[PDB]
Design a protein around this motif. Structure first.
Motif, PDB file in Angstrom:
ATOM      1  N   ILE A 154       0.787  -1.166   0.055  1.00  0.00           N
ATOM      2  CA  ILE A 154       0.097   0.014  -0.033  1.00  0.00           C
ATOM      3  C   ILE A 154       0.846   0.978  -0.059  1.00  0.00           C
ATOM      4  CG2 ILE A 154      -1.667   1.332   1.092  1.00  0.00           C
ATOM      5  CD1 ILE A 154      -2.632  -1.457   2.502  1.00  0.00           C
ATOM      6  N   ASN A 155       1.145   1.851  -1.324  1.00  0.00           N
ATOM      7  CA  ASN A 155       1.677   3.105  -1.344  1.00  0.00           C
ATOM      8  C   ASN A 155       1.005   4.191  -1.141  1.00  0.00           C
ATOM      9  OD1 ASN A 155       3.751   1.306  -2.382  1.00  0.00           O
ATOM     10  ND2 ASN A 155       3.243   1.561  -4.538  1.00  0.00           N
ATOM     11  N   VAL A 156       1.407   5.360  -0.894  1.00  0.00           N
ATOM     12  CA  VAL A 156       0.590   6.763  -0.412  1.00  0.00           C
ATOM     13  C   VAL A 156       1.443   7.720  -1.244  1.00  0.00           C
ATOM     14  CG1 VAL A 156      -0.309   5.874   1.858  1.00  0.00           C
ATOM     15  CG2 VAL A 156       1.750   7.235   1.745  1.00  0.00           C
ATOM     16  N   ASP A 157       0.767   9.003  -1.395  1.00  0.00           N
ATOM     17  CA  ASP A 157       1.325  10.073  -2.326  1.00  0.00           C
ATOM     18  C   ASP A 157       1.671  11.182  -1.238  1.00  0.00           C
ATOM     19  OD1 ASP A 157       0.586   9.063  -4.955  1.00  0.00           O
ATOM     20  OD2 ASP A 157      -1.629   9.177  -4.179  1.00  0.00           O
ATOM     21  N   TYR A 158       1.038  11.308  -0.279  1.00  0.00           N
ATOM     22  CA  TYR A 158       1.197  12.355   0.850  1.00  0.00           C
ATOM     23  C   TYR A 158       1.302  11.969   2.228  1.00  0.00           C
ATOM     24  CZ  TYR A 158       0.989  15.899  -3.133  1.00  0.00           C
ATOM     25  OH  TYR A 158       1.125  16.602  -4.153  1.00  0.00           O
ATOM     26  N   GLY A 176      11.591   8.815  -2.350  1.00  0.00           N
ATOM     27  CA  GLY A 176      10.896   8.937  -3.346  1.00  0.00           C
ATOM     28  C   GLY A 176       9.324   8.244  -3.129  1.00  0.00           C
ATOM     29  N   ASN A 177       9.378   7.779  -2.437  1.00  0.00           N
ATOM     30  CA  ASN A 177       8.014   6.803  -2.047  1.00  0.00           C
ATOM     31  C   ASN A 177       6.662   7.593  -1.743  1.00  0.00           C
ATOM     32  OD1 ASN A 177       9.551   4.477  -2.597  1.00  0.00           O
ATOM     33  ND2 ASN A 177       9.936   4.094  -0.654  1.00  0.00           N
ATOM     34  N   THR A 178       6.989   8.828  -1.449  1.00  0.00           N
ATOM     35  CA  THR A 178       5.778   9.485  -1.058  1.00  0.00           C
ATOM     36  C   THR A 178       6.423  11.208  -0.754  1.00  0.00           C
ATOM     37  OG1 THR A 178       3.949   9.950   0.636  1.00  0.00           O
ATOM     38  CG2 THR A 178       5.982   9.436   1.563  1.00  0.00           C
ATOM     39  N   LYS A 179       5.561  11.996  -0.602  1.00  0.00           N
ATOM     40  CA  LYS A 179       5.869  13.217  -0.267  1.00  0.00           C
ATOM     41  C   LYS A 179       5.545  13.466   1.100  1.00  0.00           C
ATOM     42  CE  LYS A 179       7.098  15.372  -4.031  1.00  0.00           C
ATOM     43  NZ  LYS A 179       6.242  16.289  -4.863  1.00  0.00           N
TER      44      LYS A 179
END
Ligand SMILES: Nc1ncnc2c1ncn2[C@@H]1O[C@H](COP(=O)(O)OP(=O)(O)OP(=O)(O)OP(=O)(O)OP(=O)(O)OC[C@H]2O[C@@H](n3cnc4c(N)ncnc43)[C@H](O)[C@@H]2O)[C@@H](O)[C@H]1O
Ligand SMILES: [Mg+2]
Ligand code: NA
Length: 214
Positions: free
Chosen positions: A101-105, A189-192
């Motif tokens: 489960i990746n996230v953006d922020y 680099g996997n999220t901000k």
């Protein structure tokens, strides 16, 4: 878009979650809300949380992981979601990694410890929606009533001062480490990652978050 909100108890995560849900049309996944709902309904998955929350302690990782896994499998999460109260421990975060489960922020809400008690003791909630108010700092249009439904607001059983203080100890002992966790993820680099000043007025915190989320 997928978002994690981090911050101490009473930092304003749930308040700001409502605005993010509206703008980007993604559901709020609030483990606190989900646990309270399970207790209220006597649901087999989560009713066990009753005594734990009253004690101001964290519910076991395995229970909340199960609740979240069930909730984000729903179709309304297919195009993104907002995590509010999850993850709350390192193993909960690693469980997300394990599941891919990746996230953006990841958005951190900073508030001094000294503000937390007087925030939570004035907190009033609309349980069905997750909306929350403050009788002094952010009151409803009509006292004791939800602005959107007109339904009677309630006071959470775990929102007395002593329970808040215990929650804060739990946070610093178990949860604060997630700042470094997701700061490290961001550097890979996997999220901000972004930190906001949660002491600003509600509308200004909203504006700051909107500027980050673009
Ligand atoms: N993953 C998990 N793992 C294990 N156990 C878990 C778990 N998740 C939940 N649990 C269990 O559930 C229990 C309760 O957890 P939880 O449901 O998360 O409650 P909490 O720890 O007290 O903190 P919140 O996340 O509800 O506060 P908030 O940051 O959303 O701030 P809010 O917007 O409400 O605002 C606070 C007050 O301030 C007001 N306010 C908001 N913004 C502002 C502002 N800018 N200025 C002035 N006032 C503001 C609000 O109106 C409000 O009254 C835990 O103890 C645990 O037992
Ligand atoms: Mg919350
Ligand atoms: Na990502």
């Amino acid at each position: 878009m997928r978002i994690i909100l981090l911050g101490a108890p009473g930092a304003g995560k749930g308040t700001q979650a409502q605005f993010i849900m509206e703008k980007y049309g993604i559901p709020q996944i609030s483990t606190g809300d989900m646990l309270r709902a399970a207790v209220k309904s006597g649901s087999e998955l989560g009713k066990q949380a009753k005594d734990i929350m009253d004690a101001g302690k964290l519910v076991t990782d395995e229970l909340v992981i199960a609740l979240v896994k069930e909730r984000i499998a729903q179709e309304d999460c297919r195009n993104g979601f907002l995590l509010d109260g999850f993850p709350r421990t390192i193993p909960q975060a690693d469980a997300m990694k394990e599941a891919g489960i990746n996230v953006d922020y990841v958005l951190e809400f900073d508030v001094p410890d000294e503000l937390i008690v007087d925030r939570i003791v004035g907190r009033r909630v609309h349980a069905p929606s997750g909306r929350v108010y403050h009788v002094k700092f952010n009151p409803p249009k009509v006292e004791g009533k939800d602005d959107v439904t007109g339904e009677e607001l309630t006071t959470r059983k775990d929102d007395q001062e002593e329970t808040v203080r215990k929650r804060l100890v739990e946070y610093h002992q178990m949860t604060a480490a997630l700042i470094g966790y997701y700061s490290k993820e961001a550097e890979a680099g996997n999220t901000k990652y972004a930190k906001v000043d949660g002491t600003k007025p509600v509308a200004e915190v909203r504006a700051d978050l909107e500027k980050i989320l673009g």
